[PDB]
Symmetry: D3
Subunit: 173 residues, 6 copies
């Protein structure tokens, strides 16, 4: 029951992410179905790529496209699909594609879950390799889909991420 999962303790300082796909996962897109509480296969992709972090959404949020906001958790160990992890947003991967703007929050596990990301506050605090892996996956994983293109824009910082999350919380209400 996704209705019982809070947005967070003190959003947007922390948000809860319901995980859909693990880091290292195949480029098979899954979408959670609210009523069923089940992950639905949405599309198989054929690029030779793997998800560059754990990927999910924040419940009770709404993007302008009418979906909950997506979050790439940039840790290294795989998480179980359907689990919930509390995270600190640190930035936004800002893109444009065929259908317009596409923005993905970048987040690390919250500090009560691990010391590893204690001192990471903004996307620029992550290693440049990790940032580029994230951008590269989302830029290219749809390349073998006819006509689908992605342009990577200027990244949003930690303050932009907080604003974007609050906007989506408001938009859901």
């Amino acid at each position: 029951n996704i209705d019982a999962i809070s947005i967070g303790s003190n959003p947007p300082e922390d948000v809860n992410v319901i995980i859909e796909v693990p880091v290292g996962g195949q480029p098979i897109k899954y979408e959670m179905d609210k009523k069923a509480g089940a992950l639905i296969v949405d599309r198989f992709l054929y690029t030779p790529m793997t998800y560059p972090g754990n990927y999910g959404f924040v419940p009770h949020t709404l993007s302008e496209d009418g979906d909950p906001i997506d979050v790439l958790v940039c840790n290294t160990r795989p998480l179980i699909p359907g689990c919930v992890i509390n995270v600190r947003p640190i930035g936004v991967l800002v893109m444009e594609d065929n259908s317009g703007k596409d923005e993905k929050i970048i987040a690390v596990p919250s500090p009560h879950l691990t010391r590893r990301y204690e001192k990471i506050h903004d996307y620029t605090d992550m290693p440049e390799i990790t940032l580029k892996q994230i951008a590269h996956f989302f830029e290219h994983y749809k390349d073998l889909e006819p006509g689908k293109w992605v342009k990577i824009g200027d990244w949003g910082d930690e303050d932009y991420a907080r604003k974007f999350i609050v906007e989506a919380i408001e938009r859901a209400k």
Copy 2:
């Protein structure tokens, strides 16, 4: 997961939704979904040195002659997440006989809105012969070390037989 929120399909029997229990390449440990709890229950550990030849699950809101939802082997190549739902096109039926009588398993491919790979696969005979043999070989032999169990593979049912089988199982459930 609430099973009642998952439909049989958009336009069954041309498509059905399969709730995945075990992935392709998975160990032969039989998992079975409980309908109320929405949880996969371990049903039986098997000990043959074998692996599932496709992603395996069942279609919700259907009933076999034996009182279980119908089973589907999804013959794509990549492992799927246990407990996910995938929409599929039925293409045939693996028909068998064992200790307790008839045992029939739908063979299906991912629907064409999920991937173009299986666009032109309509009948089980459209799949590579070896894939079909792999499927039969698994189901024929994975219970070989269960004392006193036996399985015989019968003639495969075609895509028309698969449609009729599904419609019958939908009625049986309703």
Copy 3:
């Protein structure tokens, strides 16, 4: 999933149902079950270079003195799917002390209707001594990098203790 639809077992404490959190071989992560949500909530990442020595999970509708469901290590060899349910036979209790007091974990094997492999195992002493040492070593050390967390392994509880422990937790939850 809905945990109120998952029973404690058919004839507790001869058998109990364990909801699996982490498979044998899995890197250590701790979770809390959100009963309302029916989702596993990440609680802590551990960083010791250790792997669970069995499939690990908890028994719903039970309550420890510390206010959590009782934990079970299932000492079979193959990994199970996180979030599945397995019916098990309790055979003993790993009994420990740590910075928060007494900490007891049930040791269990799959029930005999799932596999014949453990059918003669009734007590923790029926297991290979090495398996018991592995289990103790894991729980003694896996929190070693957390500040102020220490663990001392005490005397194991037998199958009679394990059943009493379970019954006490079932009552405690009422």
Copy 4:
């Protein structure tokens, strides 16, 4: 690697050295080492949905009647690194007939100085019955999808048969 610098063993046939080709859990892709290059050559891809039931390799400086080094299935639980060398105790022989005549696989466990786990295992009958049945099942069935290939499992050889078999192959290679 330089196979000439790898001895048959310390005191064969009580111990022999096995050069590992394929790990337990491995896909049924047959690898064969080339003596002069010291490299594993791919020999055949098999398509049964099966996995090797033990670590599998050969004893160097031995020769079967058919002109190959003798094969050994090391029946421990953990995968070993292909191309490594492990010292083992032979305990029996899986004896088969196929299209090209007799086919025999030595069964062995890790020698007692590598682990205490198999210290008391002297004959194949000392292993759990299921492990033996898994080993037979694999070799009986993994070639089932190869056109025209057949395999019959004959009576197992005991530990004294295995030793004699090894001694004969050591002598044949001189």
Copy 5:
């Protein structure tokens, strides 16, 4: 001992490939040290990509750049690094990068190892998606390396593949 591995039984109809990275493998580049008879790490790549077939090189061959020729074996199961597999060449992936022309042989397992590929003689016999996956990987896998670029050219057919291999065998003599 690489001098005890032949080029093949009847090159260029078959050649032996020493495997470096398996299908599904995270990309690492090696140099083969002929005297040590060992793979030496040359470069860790960090793109979130995986080799689209089993990848290796043919001993006793020499490209114009003075490297053994590289082969991507387009089967589905992973092979052990350092093993040798006999393959049938079916085409050439032709590219341009920072260092000039760059060409990689595409091959399938030879028919005495498996019947699965026995009707595949030219790159056009492969599924078009497999060809696109292969191009995508070699186009993009160096994207996180500063300044590295790749342009994919026209594929070479099975006749071109055989000519290319024979030139490299002569070049090595």
Copy 6:
């Protein structure tokens, strides 16, 4: 042919490590045999632990105990057993056990293989979690062997690492 692999290009600042066990590897001890160029199984351990980095030895070195020096490469991707990787020593894990002093060099891959470790020169430059993971593995993985004990002493810095290597190079001559 280990005698053809050099100690490094400019040792002790870099050294070549012949890999025996990969990171995440089971605690099964493998020991390379010089004359055969083969990894020999030496002991199966039963602690529920995994190697915290890639592990191997530097050829043409000799410890007081008569063995090549051991190196733990504290990267994250698994390496092939038997490959050679050039590394930068950054420190030493100093221990005492049943047989006396036991010292293991800690190293990162050299900067011409990757930019990820560019700025790491001393063990104190690594994250505390990584250091504690390495010490924990060596401290405990022999706990279930009869009589085997390990005490972790004070870590040696990058200079002590280089001195230790130079002593082992001189000792081999």
